[PDB]
Homo-oligomer: A and B are copies of this chain.
Amino acid sequence: EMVETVCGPVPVEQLGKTLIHEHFLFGYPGFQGDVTRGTFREDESLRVAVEAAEKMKRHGIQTVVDPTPNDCGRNPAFLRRVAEETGLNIICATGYLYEGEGAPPYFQFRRLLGTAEDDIYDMFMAELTEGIADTGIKAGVIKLASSKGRITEYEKMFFRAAARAQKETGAVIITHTQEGTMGPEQAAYLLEHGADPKKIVIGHMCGNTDPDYHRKTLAYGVYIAFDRFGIQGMVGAPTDEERVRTLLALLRDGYEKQIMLSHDTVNVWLGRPFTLPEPFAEMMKNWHVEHLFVNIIPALKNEGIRDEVLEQMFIGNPAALFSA
């Protein structure tokens, strides 16, 4: 009946309207080494993060799941500061990013020692049931990630440890898929290791534009996330128009009880500030926390998507996800 937030245990029935995948703070592994020229502005970062939290509250959002990985500058105490100020429910994660964009050398070394999987399991259990560092904050979700075209041996260690921790705690698993690949394989690998499909969210599914690929993943009984609305412009990556077109094809087939939507925003970047190039910046202009409510939902309503369907995705599914 309860889920661990950055402000302690909160009743699952009181979560309400939820964004399943947003980042208040995020940095690419290695940002720590650029501290001299990319200093952390704590007061300014809080101001921007609270501003983003207030923007979501104006659209009826009461809960945000922040799946910032452990190796990507996850800061539970900072998230608590945002939540204590706004009253917004924030659920943080425990886990690492995939091999290509994470920081693997540490657990790759423990893999050589032959304790890595047990060490990761131990980390998951400690952060889910005891607390993260000395913050007293317990993670409410386990974050997993896989590479493009394959789930690597490094990544599989985390997948097996998450499945073990999932059986012991009943925690929710949120995943990262790279470039619309490994969706069905993630679900398959987790289930055969004992994980509950009703507690798994396969993320970044909007990265694939083939409805058959989605149906194959949805066949496992898992949740899928169209969580990257706003991110477009890359040569291989899909557009928001292609995302909606894929979403409408699944809502026609009646998969609403298994679909959730988000933006995957990075509200405050860790490390040195940057500016996107002229063509890319224009294509990424819609990448903000209000995009779904201002642009996407009205476009869905014009296609004939009912309010009950939208409320099932934003309110119903998160409530069913965190419930035992």
A-side residues, CB < 8 A to B, are 27-37, 39, 69-71, 74, 96, 100-110, 113-115, 119, 122-123, 126-127, 130-134, 271-272, 274, 276-277
Contacts and interface: CB of A to CB of B under 8 A. Distances in A.
Contacts of A108: 28
B127 A274 contact: no
22 contacts: A28-B108, A29-B29, A29-B30, A29-B103, A29-B105, A29-B106, A30-B71, A30-B106, A30-B107, A33-B69, A33-B70, A33-B71, A34-B106, A34-B107, A36-B123, A36-B132, A36-B133, A37-B119, A37-B123, A37-B126, A103-B105, A115-B274
Contacts of A70: 32-35
> How often does this chain occur in the complex, in copies?
2
Nearest to A97: B105
Nearest to A31: B106
Contacts of A109: 28
Contacts of A134: 39
3 shortest interchain CB distances as A-B pairs: A30-B106, A33-B70, A30-B103
A277 B33 contact: no
A267 to B, nearest CB: 17
B274 A33 contact: no
Given A29-B103, A115-B274, 8 more contacts: A30-B96, A30-B105, A31-B106, A33-B96, A34-B119, A36-B127, A110-B272, A110-B274
